[PDB]
Design a binder for this molecule. Sequence first.
Ligand SMILES: NC(=O)C1=CN([C@@H]2O[C@H](COP(=O)(O)OP(=O)(O)OC[C@H]3O[C@@H](n4cnc5c(N)ncnc54)[C@H](O)[C@@H]3O)[C@@H](O)[C@H]2O)C=CC1
Ligand SMILES: Cc1cc2nc3c(=O)[nH]c(=O)nc-3n(C[C@H](O)[C@H](O)[C@H](O)COP(=O)(O)O)c2cc1C
Ligand code: SF4
Ligand code: SF4
Ligand code: SF4
Ligand code: SF4
Ligand code: FES
Ligand code: FES
Ligand SMILES: [Mg+2]
Lengths: 59, 42, 230, 62, 217, 431
Amino acid sequence: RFRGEHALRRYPSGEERCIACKLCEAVCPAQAITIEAEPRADGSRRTTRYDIDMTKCIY
Amino acid sequence: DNSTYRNLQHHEYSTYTFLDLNVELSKFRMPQPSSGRQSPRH
Amino acid sequence: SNLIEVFVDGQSVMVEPGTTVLQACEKVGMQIPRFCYHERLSVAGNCRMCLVEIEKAPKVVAACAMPVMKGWNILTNSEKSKKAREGVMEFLLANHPLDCPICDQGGECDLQDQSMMFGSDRSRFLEGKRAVEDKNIGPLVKTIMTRCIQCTRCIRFASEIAGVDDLGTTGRGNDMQVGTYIEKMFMSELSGNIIDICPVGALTSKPYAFTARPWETRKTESIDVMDAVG
Amino acid sequence: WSSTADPLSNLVLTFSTKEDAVAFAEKNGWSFDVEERKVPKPKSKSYGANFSWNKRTRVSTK
Amino acid sequence: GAGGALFVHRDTPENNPDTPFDFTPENYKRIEAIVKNYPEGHKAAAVLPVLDLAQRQNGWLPISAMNKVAEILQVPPMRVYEVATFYTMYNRKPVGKYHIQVCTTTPCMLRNSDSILEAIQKKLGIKVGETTPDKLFTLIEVECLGACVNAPMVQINDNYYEDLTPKDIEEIIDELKAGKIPKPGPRSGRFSCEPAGGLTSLTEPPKGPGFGVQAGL
Amino acid sequence: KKTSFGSLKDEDRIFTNLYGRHDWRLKGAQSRGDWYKTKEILLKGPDWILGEVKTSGLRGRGGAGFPTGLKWSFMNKPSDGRPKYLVVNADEGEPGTCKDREIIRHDPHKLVEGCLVGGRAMGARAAYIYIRGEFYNEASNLQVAIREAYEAGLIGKNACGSGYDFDVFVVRGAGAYICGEETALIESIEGKQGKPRLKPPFPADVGVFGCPTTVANVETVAVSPTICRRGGAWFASFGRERNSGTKLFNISGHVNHPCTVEEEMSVPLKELIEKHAGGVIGGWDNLLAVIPGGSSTPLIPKSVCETVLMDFDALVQAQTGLGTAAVIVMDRSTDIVKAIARLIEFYKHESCGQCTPCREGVDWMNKVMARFVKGDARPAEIDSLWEISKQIEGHTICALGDGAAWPVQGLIRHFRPELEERMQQFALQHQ
Ligand SMILES: NC(=O)C1=CN([C@@H]2O[C@H](COP(=O)(O)OP(=O)(O)OC[C@H]3O[C@@H](n4cnc5c(N)ncnc54)[C@H](O)[C@@H]3O)[C@@H](O)[C@H]2O)C=CC1
Ligand SMILES: Cc1cc2nc3c(=O)[nH]c(=O)nc-3n(C[C@H](O)[C@H](O)[C@H](O)COP(=O)(O)O)c2cc1C
Ligand code: SF4
Ligand code: SF4
Ligand code: SF4
Ligand code: SF4
Ligand code: FES
Ligand code: FES
Ligand SMILES: [Mg+2]
C-alpha cells in the first residue's frame, strides 16, 4: 500500500489506460495535476498533456 | 338444419376482397367533415 | 378572478386553470424531477420521473402533464413519490452504459445528478445490458445511442422548433431506437441545440469532444455577433 | 501552464439580494455593473393540445 | 427472446431509393377510396392501410415503397418509417410465397404447439426464422393469433389453419406444394370452435324478432 | 333475490349464432331478431337508450368492467362544433380470448346494429371498427354485412325512417397487441405508432382526430340492441348485483373440449368448466391452476377455483379480477413457471416502449423469469422480482405494465415453494 513516485500504467496490449476523465485532477487536494485532452488520430479519448507538479503534491 | 355450417364463403376471399368491398362502399358514405385546412402542417 | 386554490405540501397557492402539478410546485419553489419534460416543447409524459402523490389519491400522477385540480394537496416529498422516483431511476439505469469517465456529459448530466438526489445508491440488476449501433447525422452532433434514455426531446425539438421531421423512433419495446432509419444528416441552422436539450451524453458536441470538464470552465456572460439578433 | 498577475481572478462573492451586493460594492469602493435578474416567464402547457382537431399544435409523432 | 431483425436501413442493390415501385391504377382507385374514408383534414390516417396495400402488391415493403406512400399522402418519410418498423405484419425484407406463422403463446403451447413447430421444421428443412431455398415458404414464430380455443393453429397468407396435428400440417404443406389451396378452418371436423362432442349450447332453434320485446316499443 | 347462477336457457342467450351454424348474412340475422324495430329505438331518443343501458347494469366487456352507461352518457354533452365518433375495439389481443372474433365472423349484423344504436345514444356521426389485422376473413365478412346494411337502408343516409345519418367504417390494424388499448387504438387510426396517450384528456373530450369519442368493446356494442329491445331489467335479471347479464367465456388449455360458450354471468368456474369444456383433462383432481380472465389476470390454484364464481367482484375478492373471462386451465403435468415465463415474454414482445417503467422493467422481468425457469437464480431474488413488479405497476402510461406485473405476482404468491425447489435443484446439480 506504500505510495511512492507516480506512474502512468497501460494495458497488456501496450495502450495506455488513461482515458482523460480528469477525476484525478478534480480530486487532487493540492491542484498538482494538469490535464489537457483531445480525440486521437483514431478517435480514441486520450490525453495530450498530463503533468504532475511533484513539489506541490502531498502524496 | 343446425348441423350445417354456413360460413364457407370466407374460403373464397382473395387478396383484394377487403379493399374491393371498401371501394364498393365508398359510394354509400356521407360527406366527410373538414377541419378547415389541408393538414396540420398547412 | 378565475384563479383556483391548490396546496403544495399544505401551502396554499393560487394558480390559473390549466396549470399542471409541475408548474404549481414551481410557483412555490420546488422543482419536480424530470427527464422528458421541457418548457419550450410539447408535453410527452413518457419518462415518468415526475410522478408525485396527490393526498387522498391511491395513484401517483405525472406532474408534467396532469392539470391541477382545486383543493388538491400535492405531496412532493411523501414516501410514495420518493419510492416512485427510486423505481423510475432504477429502470432508467438498468440498461445505461458505464461510460461516465469517457462520456462528455460527466459533470453536467441530469441523469447523474438526479440519480444522486432522488435515486438509490446501488444496483440490483444482475443481467446483461443492451447495446445499439450509433447513427451518423453530420459533423456537428456526435451520436452514441447506447446512452439514450428515449426521452424524445430531440424529436420534439426537431419537429416543432426546427421544423424538420427527419428524427423519430423505430422498433418496439426495449429495442425501440431514436434515429433516422436511413443514413441522413440532420442539418439545420438550429441543429446544435439538440445537444443542449439531450439530458444525457447520447447527443454531444463533436468539435468539443474530450476537451474539457464542466467544473473546470469559467463562464463569461456575453453576446453573439454572428448576426444582428444579438 | 496558465499564469496570471491579478489577485482577484478567482474572487466571487454570494449575496441574498441585489441591494446587499450593491451596498458591499459601494462600501468597498468598487465600481459595479448591476444586471437585473432573469426569470423564465410562466407558460401555458396542454397535453391535449398535442391531439388538436384543427390547430397546428397537433403532433405527427410521439 | 431477442428480436433478430434490424431497425436501421442500409442501402442495397435490391433495396434502395431507386428500386422501381409504383401503384397499379386499380390500387390507385383503392387508395382514393381509403383516403375518402377519412375527414379532409387528416389524410395521414390512411398511412397504415395504404402501406399494407403496397405489401399486398409487392409481398414486402422496399424503402422505395415507403417513400412512394409518403409522397402520395404528403407525410414526412420518417413517419412512414416509424409505422413500418412499429407494426410486425409489415415485411421490410423479402418473404416467401407462403408465410407460415406459428403461435407459441401459453394457451397454444399448452396444447402441444412445439410438436407442430418441429413437424414444420422437419418437413421444410429450415429453421425457425429461415426461408426455403426455392423461396416458397417462410417459417416464423408469432404471439397469440386470437384462436386459442382452436389451439394449436397456424396462419398462412391470411388463412387460419386450426386444431392441427403434425400429420395435418404436413398435409397442408404438401397440398400447398402441389399447387391448390387447402380449405381453412379447424381440423378434426369440429366446425369453428364448439365443444368437440358436447353441443351444450344453441341446441333449440333461436328466437326470432319480437320474442322478448318489452311493452311500449 | 336469486342465489345460484349458471344454468342459462338457450332461448335466453344473445349471440344465437355463436357457432356459425346459421346464416350470418342479412336475412339470417333478421331471422334471429336483428334489425327489428330499430327505427323505434332510434326515434325513442338518446336519453331513453342511455337510461336503458344504465338500468341494464352492463359493465365493460373489454376487461375493465366500467359501467358502459356512464361512459356513453359522458359522450352526451351538447355539440361543440367538432364531429362525434364511436370507435369499436375489435383488436382481440389478450391470449386466451376469442369471443370478439366469433361474434364478428358469425354475427356481424348485431355488431353493426349496436354501432348504430350506440352512435344514436352518444350522437356520433360515424362508427370506426378497428379490427385486428390478422382477422382478414372476419373483416371481409364484416364488410359484406355492412354492404348489406347499406343496401337495405339500415345504415347510411337516413338509416331508417328515422332521420339520422350514420356511417360504419372498418379499419384494419397490423399486428400490434398494444393497439387494443383505447388511446393507442385512437393513435393507430390516425396513422401513428400504436402508443397510448396520457389521461386526461379522456376520449369523450379529445379522442380520434381530436374529436369527442367513445371506445367500446365489440361484445359491449353488440349486446346493446338486445338490451334496448328486451329492456335493461331483463339483462339485470341475470347475475348478482353489480355483475349483471350474460358473458362469453373462452375455455382453453388442459380441458377435454376447449370451446367458446355464452352463459349467465356469475357461474361457478368449476361448473362452467365441467358443463361446457368437458372437465379438466385427467379429471378435476388433475387440475393445477387456472388463469380466469386472460393472460393479464393472476393465476389461482385448485383450492380457490373449487368454489369461486365468475364475475368482477368475486374474482377481485379472490385477488384475480374477471378480466376478459378467458379461462386458461393447467393440470398438474405442466411447468407453471414456464407458462408464466412465456406470458412475460409475450408482454416483453408486445410493449410499445413509450414509457421507461414498462419498457425496461418488463425486459428485466423477462430475463429474470427466464433464469427462474432453469433455477439459475437465488431465493433472495424472488422478493426482488416482486419489488420490481410493484415498481412497474401503477407507474406506467397504460395498463400493459400492470398486465405484465400481475401474472408474476400471482405466480410468486401461489407457487413460491416451487420456485425455491427449482433453485435448490439447480444449485445441487451445479454446485
Ligand atoms: N379485450 C381484449 O382483448 C383485452 C382486454 N384487456 C383488459 O383491459 C383492462 C384494462 O384496460 P384499461 O382501459 O386500461 O382500464 P380502465 O379502467 O382505465 O378503462 C376502462 C374504460 O373505462 C373509461 N374510464 C375509466 N375511468 C374513467 C374516468 N374517470 N373518466 C372517464 N372515463 C373513464 C376508460 O376511458 C375506458 O374506456 C384490463 O383489465 C384487461 O383485462 C387487456 C388486453 C386485451
Ligand atoms: C394493453 C391493453 C390491450 C387491450 N386490448 C383490448 C382489445 O384488444 N380489445 C378490447 O376490447 N379491449 C382491449 N383493452 C381494453 C380497452 O381499454 C377497452 O376496450 C376500453 O377501455 C373500453 O372497453 P369497454 O367498452 O369494455 O369498456 C386493452 C387494454 C390494454 C391496457
Ligand atoms: S484522467 Fe486521471 S483519473 Fe481519469 S483515467 Fe486518466 S489518470 Fe485516471
Ligand atoms: S450520460 Fe450521464 S450517466 Fe450516462 S455515461 Fe454520460 S455522464 Fe454517465
Ligand atoms: S437522443 Fe437524447 S434527446 Fe433524443 S431521445 Fe435519446 S436521450 Fe432523449
Ligand atoms: S406501459 Fe408499456 S405499452 Fe403502455 S405506454 Fe408504457 S411502454 Fe407503452
Ligand atoms: S417529466 Fe413528466 S413523465 Fe417525464
Ligand atoms: S395463444 Fe395461440 S391463438 Fe391465442
Ligand atoms: Mg447532451
